[PDB]
Amino acid sequence: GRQFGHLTRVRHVITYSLSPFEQRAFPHYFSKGIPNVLRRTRACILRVAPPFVVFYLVYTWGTQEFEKSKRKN
Amino acid sequence: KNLLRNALVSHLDGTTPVCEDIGRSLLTYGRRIPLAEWESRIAEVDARVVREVCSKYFYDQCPAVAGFGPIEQLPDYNRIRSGMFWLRF
Amino acid sequence: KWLEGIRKWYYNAAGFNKLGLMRDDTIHENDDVKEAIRRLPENLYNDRVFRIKRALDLSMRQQILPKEQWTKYEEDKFYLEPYLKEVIRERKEREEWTKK
Amino acid sequence: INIRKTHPLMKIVNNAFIDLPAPSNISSWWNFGSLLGICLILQILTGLFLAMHYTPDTTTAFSSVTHICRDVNYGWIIRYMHANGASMFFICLFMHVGRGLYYGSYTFLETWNIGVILLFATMATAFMGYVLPWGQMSFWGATVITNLLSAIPYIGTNLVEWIWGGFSVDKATLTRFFAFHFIFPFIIAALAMVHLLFLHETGSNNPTGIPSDTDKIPFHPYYTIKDILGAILLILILMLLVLFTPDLLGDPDNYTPANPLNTPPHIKPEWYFLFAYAILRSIPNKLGGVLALVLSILVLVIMPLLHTSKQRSMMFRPISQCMFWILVADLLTLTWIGGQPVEHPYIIIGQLASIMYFLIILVMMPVASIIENNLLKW
Amino acid sequence: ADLTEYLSRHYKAPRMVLAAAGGLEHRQLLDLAQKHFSGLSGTPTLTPCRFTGSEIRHREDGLPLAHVAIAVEGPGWANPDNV
Amino acid sequence: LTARLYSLLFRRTSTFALTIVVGALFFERAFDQGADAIYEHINEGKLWKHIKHKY
Numbered sequence: 001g002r003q004f005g006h007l008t009r010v011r012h013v014i015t016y017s018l019s020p021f022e023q024r025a026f027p028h029y030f031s032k033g034i035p036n037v038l039r040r041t042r043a044c045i046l047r048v049a050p051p052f053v054v055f056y057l058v059y060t061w062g063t064q065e066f067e068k069s070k071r072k073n
Numbered sequence: 074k075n076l077l078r079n080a081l082v083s084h085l086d087g088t089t090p091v092c093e094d095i096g097r098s099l100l101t102y103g104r105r106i107p108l109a110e111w112e113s114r115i116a117e118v119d120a121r122v123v124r125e126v127c128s129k130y131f132y133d134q135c136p137a138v139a140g141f142g143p144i145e146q147l148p149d150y151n152r153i154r155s156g157m158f159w160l161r162f
Numbered sequence: 163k164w165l166e167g168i169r170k171w172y173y174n175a176a177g178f179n180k181l182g183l184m185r186d187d188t189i190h191e192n193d194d195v196k197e198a199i200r201r202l203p204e205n206l207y208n209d210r211v212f213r214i215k216r217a218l219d220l221s222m223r224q225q226i227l228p229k230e231q232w233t234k235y236e237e238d239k240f241y242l243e244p245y246l247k248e249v250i251r252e253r254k255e256r257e258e259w260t261k262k
Numbered sequence: 263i264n265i266r267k268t269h270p271l272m273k274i275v276n277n278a279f280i281d282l283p284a285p286s287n288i289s290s291w292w293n294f295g296s297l298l299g300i301c302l303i304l305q306i307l308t309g310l311f312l313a314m315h316y317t318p319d320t321t322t323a324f325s326s327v328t329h330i331c332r333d334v335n336y337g338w339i340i341r342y343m344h345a346n347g348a349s350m351f352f353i354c355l356f357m358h359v360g361r362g363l364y365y366g367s368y369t370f371l372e373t374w375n376i377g378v379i380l381l382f383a384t385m386a387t388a389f390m391g392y393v394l395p396w397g398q399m400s401f402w403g404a405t406v407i408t409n410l411l412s413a414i415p416y417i418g419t420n421l422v423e424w425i426w427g428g429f430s431v432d433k434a435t436l437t438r439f440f441a442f443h444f445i446f447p448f449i450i451a452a453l454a455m456v457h458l459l460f461l462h463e464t465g466s467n468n469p470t471g472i473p474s475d476t477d478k479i480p481f482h483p484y485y486t487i488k489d490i491l492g493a494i495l496l497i498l499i500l501m502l503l504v505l506f507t508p509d510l511l512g513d514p515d516n517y518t519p520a521n522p523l524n525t526p527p528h529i530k531p532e533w534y535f536l537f538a539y540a541i542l543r544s545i546p547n548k549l550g551g552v553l554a555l556v557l558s559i560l561v562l563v564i565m566p567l568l569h570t571s572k573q574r575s576m577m578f579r580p581i582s583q584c585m586f587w588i589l590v591a592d593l594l595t596l597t598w599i600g601g602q603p604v605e606h607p608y609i610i611i612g613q614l615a616s617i618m619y620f621l622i623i624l625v626m627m628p629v630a631s632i633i634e635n636n637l638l639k640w
Numbered sequence: 641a642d643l644t645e646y647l648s649r650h651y652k653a654p655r656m657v658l659a660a661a662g663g664l665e666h667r668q669l670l671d672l673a674q675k676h677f678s679g680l681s682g683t684p685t686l687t688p689c690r691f692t693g694s695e696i697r698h699r700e701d702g703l704p705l706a707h708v709a710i711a712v713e714g715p716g717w718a719n720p721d722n723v
Numbered sequence: 724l725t726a727r728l729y730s731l732l733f734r735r736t737s738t739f740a741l742t743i744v745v746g747a748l749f750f751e752r753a754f755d756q757g758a759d760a761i762y763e764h765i766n767e768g769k770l771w772k773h774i775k776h777k778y
């Protein structure tokens with residue numbers, strides 16, 4: 001929370017960083033980005049979507065039952 | 074220029090730095106430069122050449138930074154870059 | 163018993179064996195857990211901060227490790243639990259001494 | 263040594279915007295702090311121009327607003343910026359709250375409580391501003407919510423004839439709501455500074471919930487250009503909303519003048535307050551309805567007192583993850599049910615959605631948490 | 641065998657200087673070189689190099705001092721810019 | 724193509740400020756030309772300029 005210097009304690013850890021003018025802007029943005037987005041999609045839709053298909057069923061069923069209540073008359 | 078003259082002449086004195094100079098001056102250059110020619114190339118240097126060559130080499134390049142030890146407060150590389158050049162800051 | 167099968171499937175699908183973390187790299191830190199982290203040997207503590215820094219790196223790039231380096235459930239070297247139990251026992255003993 | 267590290271202003275700017283240690287992991291969901299800040303100053307500026315062209319009286323308010331949107335140069339785009347900026351302000355506010363609830367950042371106490379007070383303040387401010395155009399929906403919204411304040415016995419009726427400025431929605435009500443809408447965002451800015459102060463005391467979070475004390479990167483110039491990117495995305499969404507379909511979110515029923523005699527059939531809030539109105543009309547009891555609404559936002563106060571898990575985030579707890587997405591779909595269901603009329607299937611599933619909201623929060627989070635605490639041998 | 645190959649590759653014809661400073665005689669030094677370095681019998685490298693520019697840090701928090709070097713690319717041997 | 728551009732307009736800072744001002748003015752001119760061109764190209768016919776030309 002404070003400034004740098006007195007936060008943690010690390011022993012021997014080596015970090016390499018390349019220059020930004022040295023390397024490309026988008027490293028393989030259409031050969032790894034598509035498998036990464038399909039992987040992150042496949043690892044989340046089974047936990048996100050089965051409530052939303054229930055919401056879609058509730059919306060359609062409520063529309064159909066309101067039309068059921070009003071389309072006899 | 075005074076510090077360069079004093080350091081160079083006080084270094085090339087004795088026997089061992091002299092002979093080191095002979096070795097590294099015949100390998101790298103092809104000839105050992107006598108110090109009168111170094112005096113000539115010092116006399117060919119004013120403030121204009123210094124600031125133009127330093128604007129050619131120091132200013133706006135990509136450094137090699139190498140750190141060892143407790144270096145958490147060492148900046149990330151883009152802070153070294155934003156401190157390298159001037160917008161007159 | 164099949165509840166161990168639930169635990170193995172859960173440790174597979176829980177998402178913290180993906181990033182190369184073991185069981186006690188994800189513990190939430192109140193005062194007790196901060197004390198139990200400070201009570202560690204040096205080699206385990208350095209291995210711990212290294213695995214944590216790799217996890218933050220891999221979640222920064224949002225890339226998850228290859229198949230040959232996932233942490234496996236059979237070799238679950240959970241280590242932080244004895245020190246954390248000792249912290250909880252001494253804390254509850256101090257609380258009971260204050261209550262009576 | 264340096265200008266920045268000695269000067270009394272630039273130490274504040276240094277501990278805010280330049281050398282603040284921020285974690286190297288935060289995703290796009292940690293942009294909505296800066297997006298709420300930029301939306302707040304954009305609301306203040308465009309509203310200040312609207313307040314330069316506005317005459318707050320019940321005779322001439324609607325006439326003056328029509329004068330803005332016809333006769334003053336660019337008053338139509340400044341008014342549309344103000345209204346749809348309120349809409350995008352509450353989009354980014356609920357995404358900010360959803361982040362702070364999902365990733366276990368409610369283990370912070372004082373930042374969370376000052377957050378909830380900011381939520382109260384922004385909701386009251388946006389309601390008073392929605393009263394200000396003096397249309398039919400604004401008139402009846404003011405009337406019904408002031409009688410909701412009159413619902414409470416022994417305090418209510420005197421308090422409501424006190425803030426009515428009379429005995430109904432008279433001139434004084436429009437002028438009172440002009441003044442309080444025209445002062446409250448400065449208090450929101452001050453409490454936002456207090457919010458940000460307690461944050462910079464503690465330290466931020468990350469998508470893993472592991473404390474990131476090893477890998478802090480400075481705020482400038484990584485997250486500054488990340489927030490510029492977020493701001494450009496927000497301004498293009500806001501501006502496409504105000505330049506192509508400005509009526510796609512706003513009410514059609516506003517644009518009639520305030521006749522206190524008609525009471526249109528489809529009375530409703532502006533769309534951000536639908537679930538507050540859906541908890542209300544799905545309980546057939548007056549005090550029960552207003553108390554259940556206040557208990558909803560006080561349940562958001564309660565939420566730090568039920569963190570009985572032992573991870574921090576919900577990234578690593580899939581059961582609580584699925585229950586949180588059930589909670590999100592249930593709140594969107596409440597918004598949809600509030601934005602409808604009131605009949606028999608709507609009555610039933612409005613009651614069921616409110617019940618399932620309270621059951622998910624107050625019961626299902628600790629039951630999922632104790633199955634988590636049991637299941638990983640802790 | 642690798643060491644013998646190293647010794648038998650690098651040390652031959654142009655790339656060695658017999659340097660002699662101090663109170664000696666140039667004739668004698670040339671004559672002694674002519675005597676002893678006979679039979680040495682010497683008879684394909686130096687590409688330009690890439691100055692990448694990067695940052696390496698070796699964090700070790702158990703030490704009392706921080707050591708930081710930083711370099712940009714210098715001109716080389718054959719420039720007045722070196723002076 | 725790029726080397727002359729960096730050698731001229733990106734070493735110093737004042738030249739960079741001068742070229743972003745001059746580029747913003749040239750972009751103003753050409754962009755308003757293109758904008759009115761496209762907008763009165765997809766609404767050819769029912770626009771007030773041609774109806775003024777009737778009169």
Ligand code: HEM
Pocket residue numbers: 291292293294295296298299302355358359362367368370373374375376377378380381384450454457458461465466467468
């Ligand atoms: C008035 C509207 C609000 C504004 C302008 C606001 C502003 C901010 C800002 C600028 C930050 C720091 C950046 C960030 O972490 O995203 C922040 C953090 C936070 N706010 Fe708010 N906030 C508001 C409302 C709320 C509300 C209603 C809550 C919920 C009670 C809340 C809870 C939090 C939390 C938990 C954090 C820390 C998040 C983290 O470190 O990851 N805020 N807020």
Ligand code: HEM
Pocket residue numbers: 305306307308309310312313316327341344345347348349351352387388391392393394395443444445446447448
């Ligand atoms: C202190 C800063 C603010 C000023 C000076 C201000 C000023 C005004 C003025 C003059 C109006 C009447 C014009 C109109 O109705 O279109 C108005 C309306 C409104 N304001 Fe504000 N406002 C401010 C802050 C906010 C904030 C923070 C919000 C919420 C995000 C907000 C939401 C609204 C809404 C929803 C309306 C009704 C818009 C409509 O229906 O056309 N205002 N404001």
